[PDB]
Amino acid sequence: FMPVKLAQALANSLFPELDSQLRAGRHIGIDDLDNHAFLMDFQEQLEEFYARYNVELIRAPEGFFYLRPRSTTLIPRSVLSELDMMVGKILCYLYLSPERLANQGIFTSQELYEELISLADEGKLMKFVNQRSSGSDLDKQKLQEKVRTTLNRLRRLGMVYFLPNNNNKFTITEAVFRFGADVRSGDDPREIQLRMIRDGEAMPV
Template identity: 35%
Template sequence: MSAAVYPTLEAVLHDPLFPEVDVGLRSGRHYSLDGDIREYEFLQAAQEWLEAFYKRYGCRLLHGPESYYYLLSDGLLLGSRHMMVAEMLVGQTLALMRMDPAFLVRNGQIPEEKLLTMLEHLVGQERLLASLAPRTRGRDRGTDARKVREEVEKALHGLQRLGLVRRLADGDERLVLPRPAIMRFAEAVRDASDPAEALKRLVARGEARIPESLDSEDDA
């Protein structure tokens, strides 16, 4: 904390950025050095004051290794919600793709079609359909494919709202830019000798789990 910038907690709370950042953090938003420079620098300067402030609400203000801030709630005062299955699958897949240099040739931008292809490759078509387009009887290939795309679209919208991805377009091609905080999905394998292979195996077996800290709070 820089005492010269924020000598008191009151000074932090009176900063014009505080209301916006506070609401964002409470709703599960991640603020990265890459893309959220004003908010990130505010949190960096006020970190010690805000750590004590949020502790009173049963929350921790945390800083991720890829340079981003987020709020972790114990769920008692602010409440929490679990992410949708599609958000977890898409987030895990994007974290894996972000580790692969082959997908970084376009400044880290990933075509949505490649994301869909990788998702099906990792999870398997049957498991993907069972997760994102469940049916009690029969299957219609066209309807099921459309349902999967709709669920992936919703997932990307949710991940963007949390500050985990940015969505772009290059002409008619739709692109996804995984932001640094997407690596929250790789925390379980961060210490593995080959994190990418370890995450790939976990996702393929349906064993990858989202860190609790990625759950977004819905009572803020």
């Protein structure tokens, strides 16, 4: 009925955490460990197993895995927001950046917001939190709170984990590299985006 290795993987004690949290939109990385430490062992088996539900466990050249539902996906589809991709790219830069290695992977929402506002444009960014904003500090605080909420939602979807005693400090998954899907290759970001939407990996909101 099944290949030996696929049944082996499905029999692993970690397998239910993996399957369930991937169905719940969580994604695979250094954090989100229970869904990664053995999925490295059966990537092909889990991918062919998931194809039955018209969904694909996709690995980029990066070591992270994440779930993508087809158009005919049996498990229904949904998407994230622009600010989510933003915080995600900042988190990916943090993950790669060896300069902050001394942080040992632990990072604080203030560091995240500082890096985000440093790399990005404050006002053009803030246009999306609220359409009418014109540099009001109330909208800046709104953006900071929205960054906090997006970090929470990314925690729900396997990009970050709050420390047991600290919701202000967090550790990052390698699923963060999902956000670098338009930069994982030297091809154009737009043509790669077309290939993602073709492979249903990303869509504009």
